[PDB]
Amino acid sequence: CGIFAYLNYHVPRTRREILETLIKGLQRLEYRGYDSAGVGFDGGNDKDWEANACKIQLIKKKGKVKALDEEVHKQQDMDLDIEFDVHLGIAHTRWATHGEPSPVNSHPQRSDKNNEFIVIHNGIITNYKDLKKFLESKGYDFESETDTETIAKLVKYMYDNRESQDTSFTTLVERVIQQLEGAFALVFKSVHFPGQAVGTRRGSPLLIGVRSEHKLSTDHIPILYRTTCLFPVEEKAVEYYFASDASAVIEHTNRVIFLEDDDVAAVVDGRLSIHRTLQMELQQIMKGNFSSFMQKEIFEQPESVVNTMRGRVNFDDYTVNLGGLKDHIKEIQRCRRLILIACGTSYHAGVATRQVLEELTELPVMVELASDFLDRNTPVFRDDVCFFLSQSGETADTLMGLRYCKERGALTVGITNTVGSSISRETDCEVHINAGPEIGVASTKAYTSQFVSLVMFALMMCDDRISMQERRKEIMLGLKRLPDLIKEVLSMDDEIQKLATELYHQKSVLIMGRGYHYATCLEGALKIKEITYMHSEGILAGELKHGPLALVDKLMPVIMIIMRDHTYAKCQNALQQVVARQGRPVVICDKEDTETIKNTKRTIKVPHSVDCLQGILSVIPLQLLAFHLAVLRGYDVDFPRNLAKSVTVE
Amino acid sequence: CGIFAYLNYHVPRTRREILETLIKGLQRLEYRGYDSAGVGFDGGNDKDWEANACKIQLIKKKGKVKALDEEVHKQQDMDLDIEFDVHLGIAHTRWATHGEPSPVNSHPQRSDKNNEFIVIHNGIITNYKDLKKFLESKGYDFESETDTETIAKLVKYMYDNRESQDTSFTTLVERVIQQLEGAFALVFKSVHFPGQAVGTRRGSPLLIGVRSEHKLSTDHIPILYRSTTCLFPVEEKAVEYYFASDASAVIEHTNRVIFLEDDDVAAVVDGRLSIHRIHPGRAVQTLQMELQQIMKGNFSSFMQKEIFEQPESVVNTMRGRVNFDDYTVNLGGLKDHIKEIQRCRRLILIACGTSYHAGVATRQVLEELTELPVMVELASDFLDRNTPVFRDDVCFFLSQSGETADTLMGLRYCKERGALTVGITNTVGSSISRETDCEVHINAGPEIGVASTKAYTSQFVSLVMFALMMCDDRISMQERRKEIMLGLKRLPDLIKEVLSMDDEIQKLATELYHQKSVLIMGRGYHYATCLEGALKIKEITYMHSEGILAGELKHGPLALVDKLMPVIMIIMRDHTYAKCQNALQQVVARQGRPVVICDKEDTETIKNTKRTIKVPHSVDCLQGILSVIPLQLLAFHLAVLRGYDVDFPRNLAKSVTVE
Ligand SMILES: O=C[C@H](O)[C@@H](O)[C@H](O)[C@H](O)COP(=O)(O)O
Ligand SMILES: O=C[C@H](O)[C@@H](O)[C@H](O)[C@H](O)COP(=O)(O)O
Ligand SMILES: N[C@@H](CCC(=O)O)C(=O)O
Numbered sequence A: 001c002g003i004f005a006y007l008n009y010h011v012p013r014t015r016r017e018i019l020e021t022l023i024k025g026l027q028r029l030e031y032r033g034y035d036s037a038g039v040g041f042d043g044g045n046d047k048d049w050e051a052n053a054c055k056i057q058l059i060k061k062k063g064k065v066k067a068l069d070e071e072v073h074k075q076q077d078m079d080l081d082i083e084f085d086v087h088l089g090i091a092h093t094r095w096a097t098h099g100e101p102s103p104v105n106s107h108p109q110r111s112d113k114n115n116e117f118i119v120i121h122n123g124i125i126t127n128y129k130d131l132k133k134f135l136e137s138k139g140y141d142f143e144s145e146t147d148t149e150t151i152a153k154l155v156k157y158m159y160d161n162r163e164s165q166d167t168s169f170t171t172l173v174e175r176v177i178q179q180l181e182g183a184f185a186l187v188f189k190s191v192h193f194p195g196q197a198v199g200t201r202r203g204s205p206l207l208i209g210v211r212s213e214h215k216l217s218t219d220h221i222p223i224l225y226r227t228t229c230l231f232p233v234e235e236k237a238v239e240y241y242f243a244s245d246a247s248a249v250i251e252h253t254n255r256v257i258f259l260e261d262d263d264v265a266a267v268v269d270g271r272l273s274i275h276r277t278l279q280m281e282l283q284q285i286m287k288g289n290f291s292s293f294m295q296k297e298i299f300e301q302p303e304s305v306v307n308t309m310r311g312r313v314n315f316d317d318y319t320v321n322l323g324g325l326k327d328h329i330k331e332i333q334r335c336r337r338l339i340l341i342a343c344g345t346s347y348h349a350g351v352a353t354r355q356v357l358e359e360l361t362e363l364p365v366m367v368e369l370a371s372d373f374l375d376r377n378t379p380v381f382r383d384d385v386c387f388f389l390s391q392s393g394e395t396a397d398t399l400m401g402l403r404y405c406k407e408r409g410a411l412t413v414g415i416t417n418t419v420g421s422s423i424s425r426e427t428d429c430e431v432h433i434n435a436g437p438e439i440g441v442a443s444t445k446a447y448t449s450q451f452v453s454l455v456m457f458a459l460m461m462c463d464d465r466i467s468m469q470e471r472r473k474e475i476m477l478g479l480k481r482l483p484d485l486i487k488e489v490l491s492m493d494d495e496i497q498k499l500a501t502e503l504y505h506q507k508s509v510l511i512m513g514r515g516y517h518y519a520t521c522l523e524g525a526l527k528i529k530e531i532t533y534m535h536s537e538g539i540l541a542g543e544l545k546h547g548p549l550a551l552v553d554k555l556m557p558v559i560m561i562i563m564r565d566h567t568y569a570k571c572q573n574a575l576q577q578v579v580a581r582q583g584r585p586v587v588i589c590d591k592e593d594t595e596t597i598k599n600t601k602r603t604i605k606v607p608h609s610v611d612c613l614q615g616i617l618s619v620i621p622l623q624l625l626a627f628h629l630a631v632l633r634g635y636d637v638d639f640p641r642n643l644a645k646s647v648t649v650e
Numbered sequence B: 001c002g003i004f005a006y007l008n009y010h011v012p013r014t015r016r017e018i019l020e021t022l023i024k025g026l027q028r029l030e031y032r033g034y035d036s037a038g039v040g041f042d043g044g045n046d047k048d049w050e051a052n053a054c055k056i057q058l059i060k061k062k063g064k065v066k067a068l069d070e071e072v073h074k075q076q077d078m079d080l081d082i083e084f085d086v087h088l089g090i091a092h093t094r095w096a097t098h099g100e101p102s103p104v105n106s107h108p109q110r111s112d113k114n115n116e117f118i119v120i121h122n123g124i125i126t127n128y129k130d131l132k133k134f135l136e137s138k139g140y141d142f143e144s145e146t147d148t149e150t151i152a153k154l155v156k157y158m159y160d161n162r163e164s165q166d167t168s169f170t171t172l173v174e175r176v177i178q179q180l181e182g183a184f185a186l187v188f189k190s191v192h193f194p195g196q197a198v199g200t201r202r203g204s205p206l207l208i209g210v211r212s213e214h215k216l217s218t219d220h221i222p223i224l225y226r227s228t229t230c231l232f233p234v235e236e237k238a239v240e241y242y243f244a245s246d247a248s249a250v251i252e253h254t255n256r257v258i259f260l261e262d263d264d265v266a267a268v269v270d271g272r273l274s275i276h277r278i279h280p281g282r283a284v285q286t287l288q289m290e291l292q293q294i295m296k297g298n299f300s301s302f303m304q305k306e307i308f309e310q311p312e313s314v315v316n317t318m319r320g321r322v323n324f325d326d327y328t329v330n331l332g333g334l335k336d337h338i339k340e341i342q343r344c345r346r347l348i349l350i351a352c353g354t355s356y357h358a359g360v361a362t363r364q365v366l367e368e369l370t371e372l373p374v375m376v377e378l379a380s381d382f383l384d385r386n387t388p389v390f391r392d393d394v395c396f397f398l399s400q401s402g403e404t405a406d407t408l409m410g411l412r413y414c415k416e417r418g419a420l421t422v423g424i425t426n427t428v429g430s431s432i433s434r435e436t437d438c439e440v441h442i443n444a445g446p447e448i449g450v451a452s453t454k455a456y457t458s459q460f461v462s463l464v465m466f467a468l469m470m471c472d473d474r475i476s477m478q479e480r481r482k483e484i485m486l487g488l489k490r491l492p493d494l495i496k497e498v499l500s501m502d503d504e505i506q507k508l509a510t511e512l513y514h515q516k517s518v519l520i521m522g523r524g525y526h527y528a529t530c531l532e533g534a535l536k537i538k539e540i541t542y543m544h545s546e547g548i549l550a551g552e553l554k555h556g557p558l559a560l561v562d563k564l565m566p567v568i569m570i571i572m573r574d575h576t577y578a579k580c581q582n583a584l585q586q587v588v589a590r591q592g593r594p595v596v597i598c599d600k601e602d603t604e605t606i607k608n609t610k611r612t613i614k615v616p617h618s619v620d621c622l623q624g625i626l627s628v629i630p631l632q633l634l635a636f637h638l639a640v641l642r643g644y645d646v647d648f649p650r651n652l653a654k655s656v657t658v659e
Helices: A015-027 A065-072 A128-138 A149-159 A169-177 A293-299 A301-309 A329-333 A344-361 A370-375 A396-407 A422-426 A445-461 A466-490 A493-500 A515-532 A541-546 A568-580 A594-599 A614-632 B015-027 B065-073 B128-138 B149-160 B169-177 B302-308 B310-318 B338-342 B353-370 B379-385 B405-416 B431-435 B454-470 B475-499 B502-512 B524-541 B550-555 B577-589 B603-608 B620-641
Strands: A002-014 A036-042 A056-062 A083-094 A117-125 A182-190 A197-202 A207-211 A238-243 A264-268 A271-275 A337-342 A365-369 A384-390 A411-416 A429-432 A508-513 A535-540 A558-562 A586-590 A603-606 B002-014 B036-042 B056-062 B083-094 B117-125 B182-190 B197-202 B207-211 B220-225 B239-244 B256-259 B265-269 B272-277 B281-283 B346-351 B374-378 B393-399 B420-425 B517-522 B544-549 B567-571 B595-599 B612-615
Touching (some): A002 A117, A002 A182, A015 A083, A117 A149, A128 A149, A149 A182, A169 A182, A169 A197, A197 A238, A293 A301, A301 A466, A329 A411, A337 A370, A344 A365, A344 A445, A344 A466, A344 A515, A344 B379, A365 A370, A370 A396, A370 B550, A384 A396, A411 A422, A411 A445, A445 A466, A466 A614, A493 A614, A508 A515, A508 A541, A508 A568, A515 A614, A535 B544, A541 A568, A541 B379, A586 A614, A594 A603, B002 B015, B002 B182, B002 B197, B015 B065, B083 B117, B117 B128, B117 B149, B128 B149, B149 B169, B149 B182, B169 B265, B169 B272, B197 B239, B256 B281, B302 B310, B302 B620, B310 B454, B310 B475, B338 B420, B338 B454, B346 B353, B353 B393, B374 B379, B420 B454, B454 B475, B475 B620, B502 B612, B524 B544, B544 B550, B567 B577, B595 B603, B595 B620, B612 B620
Parallel strands (some): A337 A365, A384 A411, A586 A603, B346 B393, B393 B420, B595 B612
Antiparallel strands (some): A002 A238, A117 A182, A182 A197, A264 A271, B207 B239, B220 B281, B265 B272
């Protein structure tokens, strides 16, 4: 889901400049939800913009944002030339996880057939059914099945029973949130409060951008309780940008005000009051010269790996320092167990580093899927160190596992790629993988950056063990050489594309690996599932003989991973078993693995690295393969079907 | 792959009776798989059996045992009526490793063209290359491409180079095994030791059955190192011995067996059984196994039998352990260790395949009732990572066979680090049941089918019973324990209720008959049900079935759902019900039309879902047993519809080395 609104106060914008700003704001947020979209602006065709704020127009349509961009245009009733000196427009892209992604279920919702109050909502109201029966008995009719409509039909109920003729828009919103349960990030608009916007949040992101050629009256808005507002000093020119993400606002200004839970922001008379510089460059959210975000993010891994280690890894003296842990590493080493909790590819990053964490810490290491971790009420203890891997820092199950472990007194550590996220804030300490914004739905650099981050932690946990000095040096030299080796893998892009032309027509593919490459075959199978829609499955190589090997014949595509580590011989037995079953597999192996290369037709030869880093090099070909397969099948790699990025609700 | 030898000592048997006994023995060993079989016995047609001892006859053939039985009676020079007061016959089914299947590569392997020594072998001699070069340099010509022939040629080399004319058959074999490297189970026969047998093993099962109408000298054979120290009938000579690599070949003649251990050399000399080794001893123990337990009966396949007899195998697993009169649990196998176990700080379950799924299926209740960390590891990955293990860990090893290599090596790994080891096995005398500090035999009866059906559900019940032991002193858990135990009391009848829906499963099998993939989705107690169901359909049906954790759909796998991909969802009445419904709304929202396995009374889902398999409600931590059975049957029926032999093992090892 995504939220974006544009409030231009005494900065004249025509109706086309606003609609093109609402759509352009949703395009920056489309990667969070692309099942439907909508916009809410002022209607009417009066040359005097003042006589139009009493008419709200809603243009909602099913599909991505490009389906709404064309629905907004070529309309016969909306004159796009009216100049508005003061105007508020709200927009929203929706991730329809339930029901149909129809225009009636898309946002902004409405409170009646005349649009007196329209709201855009990100989250879930855990008591909308009770609010739907109370509002229906008073005389309100419902049109949609979404839980957002109960917020629109309720802000009007507080307006129809107010005590004074001029109850501020904040008071109406404050009474609403008091009746809403669960999480929500809202942005209201009403004809009765022209140009006024109200932004409240609870368990969901919501910031407010500001731009103005004049000086701002302060840089610390004081929270109020039922010399106070943020506004231009001498003049009135100001532009606000409500949004649930920082990408929809960086293009216009890098000055935002990250709200907090229960903070009811409100723009009145062009002044921002709360009741109760961004460190990002636009180039980071631009595809550049690549045709897709995913392809850029795969080919930027040489850089993102370097950024993850910047200011943390010194190769002249072989020292590792994660500043985020400087005030806890001592207490972390007196703990007795590591628990890694995450979902999806973040969980695979844990599987990919579990062995080296066990090796260098000598502690038990338990890697848990967040959803199952919660279902079982897993035992947690005060001397447990619990890591929570989340590219977004907002994943529902991972965040709930965090609060679960905090309640039991465990030491909590956040491995995130989003500063200010829930997981990064609520953990005792934090490590920011610093991989840059990830716009593609599939995690590519986030995986390898989480990988490297956990290896760097492992290197801190053994920096006082004489017997492990050489092992640490081996690994750090591998990290020094890792960016260049990633480039070597990317230079085989064309070779991967050719092998993809031999598989795009297949329905299934088994990816097999063990040891350090169990995670590789799991993550590779998830990528091929997510963007290619082929039935790809990861199979632990050691488990073939126990049943799954029966599925292999000359028709079943197979990809195997055979690297030069301590499992090489065992991986050769699995390969011999596959061949005996008439399998003709593609083997990802080391360049110097002459034996494997001679006896196998299709081989992807990757350069050798340290055994505990090879997983980074062996997964990249499967990222590229998934990409090429998706292209061959006519799919879009930046907008896979049936889901979006970051699972923040239930 | 299968060994069987029958030694009748002063128990008269005709040649026909001996050969019928050997053939019958191999028939109990076919269920594993094989490519060739053979027998070795005394030739010659002299009416006096004493003179026929210097003529060993061999009949080996590539094919099934039935073809061998036809070749036995199809011998024009052989008289089947000669009566032998003393005779040793050996038989073998082969699973070719070194050398292609053929008569020459079949066992018994001989030491020369006159059959002075013959040997049947299960396993692989790793150093068969070096040994072959040595014996060839001494003047021994080989005729087969098997590693086994080196054993036959080597024992003759020891005989030819013996120091005294009366060196014992044992001493020769001792010198042979001292040069062998690898795994083996061996039975020797020779004209120079008429009527004598020598059996030895290293890393491969070998047992000895005994029968006599006369009292035996002992039930504990003492080991002899290099009249009161061997096993024999006391007042008379008559006795029968049965060497075998699987008790299934012995149980119809006797239930008194001796399980040999690595490097034991058991010898029968003058009808007396001794056990040599370069007060320790081997016990004569009684097996509770019955011939009926390894027969199909009225069922058309072992897979069908073992699925439909699960009401009975569940009861056997609980027999003598769960008291439904005062609701108590007692696992006698743990009596001398339960106190140390409760002072430990972590449970680790280590297994492969379906045994591993049994750990996943009971992890939550073990966590709930023990309140200890519970870690469930795949044995192969457990070894690759060198997982940290400590002296206060309790490590469980789940293995129907008790011989799985990675699980066994995980056991030895954990023993080296001082952990308390517990075996959950279905095979008396197996490696894991022995080497563990204690065990809990699951008592499900033998599993003859290729896939694990009753073994899974009996392991499931066994770990629940252990969980109930670990909390029998907690006041706050008395209610929960009673609930679980009333569920176990009602479980056999609920399994029958599920088996009565077999017709509903067949209908689903015809709907998936033509399908290439199917996603099986579940969470919580039914995560394991997904993994186990998907493995069964992979193993038995050969279609791409995959178990997906329902909570992980939104993180990528949901992209496979459309109007074409078959989906099976498991939704039960437990604390994860609302979350399972949400996963169902996500699947449907993406044009998915899934089959839902749910509770009988879940009226909401039954109306909103077209096809639903409606299983009866049980305790939440027991539902996995009921909801997996429809998936067992589904795999079975799909296979039948597609013309597959469900009792045929398609999983073959690496190719045969031809050299
Ligand atoms: O390709 C991976 C997907 O993007 C998805 O599997 C993702 O990894 C999880 O949803 C966890 O995301 P977070 O790291 O933000 O928690
Ligand atoms: O369908 C299950 C198969 O029979 C297989 O998965 C089995 O579970 C193990 O591979 C063998 O291990 P154990 O003999 O130790 O159980
Ligand atoms: N390795 C021996 C015996 C194999 C077996 O049957 O266990 C052979 O190939 O003949």
